[PDB]
Design a protein around this motif. Structure first.
Motif, short mmCIF file in Angstrom:
data_model
loop_
_atom_site.label_atom_id
_atom_site.label_comp_id
_atom_site.label_asym_id
_atom_site.label_seq_id
_atom_site.Cartn_x
_atom_site.Cartn_y
_atom_site.Cartn_z
N UNK A 43 0.78 -1.27 0.02
CA UNK A 43 -0.06 0.08 0.02
C UNK A 43 1.12 1.20 -0.10
N UNK B 84 0.84 6.65 -6.56
CA UNK B 84 -0.32 7.53 -6.94
C UNK B 84 0.16 8.90 -6.68
N UNK C 24 1.55 10.10 -9.83
CA UNK C 24 0.61 10.44 -10.93
C UNK C 24 0.00 11.68 -10.35
N UNK D 180 4.42 -14.44 -4.86
CA UNK D 180 3.92 -13.15 -5.01
C UNK D 180 4.80 -12.08 -5.14
N UNK E 36 4.89 -0.55 -13.96
CA UNK E 36 4.01 0.44 -13.97
C UNK E 36 4.87 1.70 -13.89
N UNK F 19 5.32 8.38 -19.92
CA UNK F 19 4.29 9.41 -19.97
C UNK F 19 4.89 10.72 -19.93
N UNK G 200 0.79 4.58 -26.50
CA UNK G 200 1.00 4.24 -25.37
C UNK G 200 0.17 3.26 -24.86
N UNK H 207 0.16 0.71 -21.02
CA UNK H 207 0.76 0.03 -19.78
C UNK H 207 0.75 -1.06 -19.97
N UNK I 244 -1.59 -11.92 -11.42
CA UNK I 244 -0.85 -12.60 -10.28
C UNK I 244 -1.46 -13.96 -10.21
N UNK I 245 -0.59 -14.95 -9.36
CA UNK I 245 -0.83 -16.21 -9.47
C UNK I 245 -2.10 -16.41 -8.51
N UNK J 129 -4.24 -11.61 -3.50
CA UNK J 129 -3.84 -11.39 -4.75
C UNK J 129 -4.88 -11.03 -5.73
N UNK K 36 -5.00 -6.93 -5.16
CA UNK K 36 -4.02 -6.07 -5.88
C UNK K 36 -4.11 -6.07 -7.49
N UNK K 37 -4.52 -7.19 -7.75
CA UNK K 37 -4.74 -6.94 -9.40
C UNK K 37 -5.85 -6.27 -9.67
N UNK L 279 -6.11 -3.31 -7.87
CA UNK L 279 -5.66 -2.26 -7.68
C UNK L 279 -4.86 -1.86 -8.67
N UNK L 280 -3.89 -2.64 -9.30
CA UNK L 280 -2.73 -2.16 -10.59
C UNK L 280 -3.85 -1.93 -11.80
N UNK M 119 -5.00 1.57 -11.30
CA UNK M 119 -3.82 2.63 -11.59
C UNK M 119 -3.81 2.70 -13.18
N UNK M 120 -3.80 1.50 -13.92
CA UNK M 120 -3.66 1.47 -15.33
C UNK M 120 -4.91 2.57 -16.07
N UNK N 87 -6.31 4.94 -14.69
CA UNK N 87 -5.82 6.19 -14.17
C UNK N 87 -4.97 6.56 -15.24
N UNK N 88 -3.87 5.91 -15.79
CA UNK N 88 -2.69 6.10 -16.67
C UNK N 88 -3.72 6.12 -18.01
N UNK O 1 -6.29 9.43 -8.87
CA UNK O 1 -6.26 7.90 -9.05
C UNK O 1 -7.03 7.47 -7.83
N UNK P 78 -5.89 3.49 -2.12
CA UNK P 78 -5.82 1.97 -2.43
C UNK P 78 -5.84 1.41 -1.11
N UNK P 79 -6.38 -0.08 -0.91
CA UNK P 79 -6.10 -0.64 0.37
C UNK P 79 -5.97 -2.07 -0.03
#
Lengths: 209, 159, 211, 159, 159, 211, 209
Positions: free
Chosen positions: B38, B45, B48, D33, D44, D51, D135, D137, D142-143, E34, E37-38, E40-41, E44-45, E47-48, E137, E140-141
């Motif tokens: 986090x 973030x 960004x 992980x 990322x 960017x 562009x 990303x 994740x597994x 797991x 987080x995916x 979350x990522x 972010x993408x 937002x990008x 963005x 996140x938690x």
């Protein structure tokens, strides 16, 4: 929008050099080289004296010199003269297409009265009214007491005295209008206007004759 | 007779306990990861949040340029009217003036007498920030957790 | 001569509207901006706004937004400032001024137009003579609103002439007098006449003075 | 008599051992992980690094435009001085030219004789990259770790 | 005599069984991390993906301005030819004309008779989106997994 | 005619400063850049900088930064180049050149100003006659610094005239001779006078030659 | 700042076609179409010959042609003439508001002297000084030796002979100044100046008389 701060009034003797300041914010005076100084006389429109913080319009005397420092404009008048006694305003562009005038400054310089007593006209008496006109002029300073007298007694009824008003020659003028019915104009023998300026008392007098 | 029941009872409690000791570590290890990730995400973030500011800063640099050009164009056209080069009533010139004035944009500010000044929103520090290009998201890392072994209670030979 | 001629003084009741004209002369009407100021008598100048004559574009001060309009007629080289929803505080002398390219120079200034907001009835003056070096004059009495303009023999002379400030009588009607000094030898040998105008009432009148 | 004490000691040793097989996997799973996620974060970060550069490229595209217009305006204004249309001592024209030369920016380069050339920093490849808008990303994953089972010792029925 | 083989045999399987329940949780905990987080990522993408679009939009804002100025300059210069102020055959004037035409860029469209119009790619909604600057963005938690306790078998005192 | 006229040759000591003027004529002084060059005698040309007469923009070469200043007087249309902290290597012929919009064309060039940096003293020449087709001349002897300009009969003639280069004496003083071939039938029937100027000493002197 | 690479010198007979190159970097020649070629005669300011890589100034002969390739300019002169013998310089814009000249190229083409011996003047003898002036002109090539002879003996005392100097007619000139006391002017019977060029020796001679 804050008016630019100017001193309320300044004084000086003839031939002396004086200066009037006009302080503002950076956004108006500091940020822009567009401050101007304007003179105005009683009963007269303002006359431009300085522009762009130093520039002198054609026909303006050399004695008037403008300057700027930070957010504070200044106008220095060297060799003070009779004509310089007047109100003076700084005006500056204040951004966003806006112009702001200062609070103004009364420049003053450091005179017996001229009395004229006119009676009611014949037409006015024929119009069932009567008025005595007491005209005072060319007295300095502008502090004068006016008194009305029926023969030898204070009238005080409907005198309507104006305030002293500055003249183009740095002096003052005034007028008093004692209105009364014609009935007590022929009745009372005469009528006197007494004017005290700085103790000195000058009296005019008339009668129906 | 000596009851050996206590000896065997001494054994199993270790296998549980050490196993628990592993489990308690493992959960903490999970927490050790989750807290850190986090912090990384938020850091990204923040980056960004930096980047977007630059875009807005760059946008101001655009608008100032729009103010820089059009007024300077208008100042020329009016000057052509001022010196009598082109008729002040020349309809084409007036149309040009109107079209330019319509394209002035926000940062342009009329100051008086057909003159417009550019109130630069992107100041010198803004321009220095844009030109510096000192953005750096920075490095990221996550921990690695050591292996945990479960120990059997060593039978103490009472020799 | 580069000059600005404003319209005459005006009196309006509260909530009404007023229009002040400012005719330009002696220069290119479209080559400057026209800036409008106001000053209460005995008080300082207040900037109101400006107008482009070339395009008609205007700027108003935020104080006057929604109440003030600026327009112009280029054929006669004139600007117009209209103030609506008039109030007592709006009673003031209003000035038009010419502003020059990239200058802080408001030059020349119009003579000014006095606008009066009061609740009031327009009344022309009563002229009386004031007969006797000796002085003689004309009494302007019982008029409203201010101001009036006094000349002598149609502006033929100015030596000795002094117009006095008018007095507000208790009845809400004004009065002044205009006096002039003449040599006592000219009595009976020269026709002396005061010409007085009250534009709000539109009272042009002459009055000869005799013993 | 047949000593069954050997049997029970065999059984617990299995329960421990099988449990260890879970634990060592789980730690590996944790590590599995972590090393993956760091690759995502840096990836990322790389996207951010792209960017920012794009912004810098676009900034150059702004700067050249400042050179493109202002000098040309000067090229017009000076021409009006050259063609005798306006007095060369016209103070307004001179102030306008000074203003324009103050607004040129860094990209313009004086080529001598009142003329400036735009040393374009954002070249053709720069403009192509900007206009491409390619562009991406990319995706991230994740597994998924499966359940682990611990086995009790199968008491061998000695039939 | 009572056969106690049932008693201790009950105990170990409990110590085993409870442990399995912890593992089943801990494995789930890994997946519980797991999956999140995916999400979350990818967020972010997203937002990008927003930020890049802004740049593209801002690039359009540049291009239109390039069409705005130069075309207007051209429309000024043509007037100087139309009014006959400078010779239409003036080589410097024609050179400026050609150079300005070369710098037109993509946003300009010819309309005949030497006149051009700017086809604005970055419309009013584009300008409002750029100027508002409502990028976020967001936060996140990630979850926190609590400790797990393995249970020994309470030896049931037959009271 | 489009022309440039530079100031006369100058002698300075090391560490001193010099100012060279270049008066323009025949065109718009503000319609070109003035580019300044220096060339040591017998060596290649060295570009120094340029100045805008219109706006006053000046570029100095990185070599000459901090020692060279460029100015102008647009009223008389005269550029000025001021060099400070003079050294021996600064001794050179300095040229002003007009340069035209969107051109690399340096045209026209000034005649050049010879700057000489040395520890020395100015001294005027001694003029001697050189009497006898026959050839006759004038010996300019013992002067410093270079150069000197010679005409014959105030430049009334140029056929046969040959001004020779000067020689640097072992004393460090200069000397040359100016000669002309004349028919032997013109001897005693035409007065021949050589007119020489040494501007650093400012000695305009004439000398008539006779058999 | 690197000077542009030109040949040190070139040679060619009259009527031939020759070329002078000027090599530099892309940053100065390649990246800018602002290469110019200037001619300079001795004792004369540079004269523009080509500009903007091909453009010919008015009054310049058609024979001179400029060209550019890469970072290398080249000036070609066809039908070589007497007046073409001179120094030639390339000059180019080198970015960042800077202009750079080339190293230069001396173009030379592929004659007995003219001696004149003047004795000391009467005024100089009265000035307690004497000088014998040997003036040489119109000799090609520019290689010459000079000797002085008191009566018939080599003087060598203060001869002050200049180097050969190019003339406007592609020839050379020189001068020698034999300084001596008037005492050793009258006593010696004669004074001679000998000038050797390409073996040929020409002698002038004067005496006090």
């Amino acid at each position: 929008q804050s008016a630019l701060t100017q001193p309320a009034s300044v004084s000086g003797s003839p031939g002396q050099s004086i200066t009037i300041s006009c302080t503002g914010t950076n956004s108006d005076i500091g940020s822009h080289n567009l401050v101007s100084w304007y003179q105005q006389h009683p009963g007269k429109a303002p006359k431009v004296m300085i522009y762009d913080d130093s520039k002198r319009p054609s026909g303006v005397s050399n004695r008037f010199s403008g300057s700027k420092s930070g957010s504070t404009a200044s106008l220095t008048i060297s060799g003070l003269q009779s004509e310089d006694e007047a109100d003076y305003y700084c005006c500056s562009y204040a951004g966003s297409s806006n112009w702001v005038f200062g609070g103004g400054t009364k420049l003053t310089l450091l005179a017996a009265p001229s009395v004229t007593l006119f009676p009611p006209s014949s037409e006015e008496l024929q119009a069932n009214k009567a008025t005595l006109v007491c005209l005072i002029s060319d007295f300095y300073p502008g502090a004068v007491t006016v008194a009305w007298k029926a023969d030898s007694s204070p009238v005080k009824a409907g005198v309507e005295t104006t305030t002293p008003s500055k003249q183009s020659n740095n002096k003052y003028a005034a007028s008093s209008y004692l209105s009364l019915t014609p009935e007590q104009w022929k009745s009372h023998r005469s009528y006197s206007c007494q004017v005290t300026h700085e103790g000195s008392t000058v009296e005019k007098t008339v009668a129906p004759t | 007779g000596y009851t050996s029941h206590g000896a065997h009872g001494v054994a199993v409690a270790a296998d549980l306990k050490s196993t628990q000791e592993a489990i308690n570590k493992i959960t903490k290890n999970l927490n050790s990861l989750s807290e850190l990730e986090v912090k990384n995400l938020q850091r990204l973030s923040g980056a960004m949040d930096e980047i977007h500011n630059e875009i807005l800063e760059l946008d101001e640099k655009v608008d100032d340029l729009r103010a820089d050009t059009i007024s300077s164009q208008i100042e020329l056209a009016v000057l052509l009217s001022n010196e009598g080069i082109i008729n002040s009533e020349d309809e084409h010139l007036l149309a040009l003036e109107r079209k330019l004035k319509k394209m002035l944009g926000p940062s342009a500010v009329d100051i008086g007498n057909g003159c417009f000044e550019t109130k630069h929103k992107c100041n010198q520090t803004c321009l220095d920030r844009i030109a510096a290009g000192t953005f750096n998201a920075g490095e990221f890392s996550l921990p690695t957790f050591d292996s945990l072994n479960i120990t059997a209670a060593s039978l103490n030979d009472d020799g | 001569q580069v000059q600005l001629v404003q319209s005459g003084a005006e009196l309006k009741k509260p909530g009404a509207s007023v229009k002040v004209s400012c005719k330009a002369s002696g220069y290119t009407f479209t080559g400057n901006y026209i800036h409008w100021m106001r000053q209460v008598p005995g008080q300082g100048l207040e900037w109101m706004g400006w107008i482009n004559p070339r395009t008609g574009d205007t700027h108003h001060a935020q104080k006057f937004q929604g109440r003030v309009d600026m327009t112009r007629d280029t054929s006669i080289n004139t600007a117009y400032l209209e103030l609506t929803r008039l109030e007592s505080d709006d009673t003031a002398l209003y000035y038009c001024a010419r502003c020059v390219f990239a200058t802080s120079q408001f030059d020349p200034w119009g003579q000014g137009t006095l606008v009066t907001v009061s609740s009031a009835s327009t009344k022309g003056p009563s002229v009386f003579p004031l007969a006797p070096t000796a002085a003689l004059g004309c009494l302007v009495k019982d008029y409203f609103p201010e101001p009036v303009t006094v000349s002598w023999n149609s502006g033929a002379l100015t030596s000795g002439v002094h117009t006095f400030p008018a007095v507000l009588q208790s009845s809400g009607l004004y009065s002044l007098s205009s006096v002039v000094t003449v040599p006592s030898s000219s009595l009976g040998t020269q026709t002396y006449i005061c010409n007085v105008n009250h534009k709000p009432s539109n009272t042009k009148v002459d009055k000869r003075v005799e013993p």
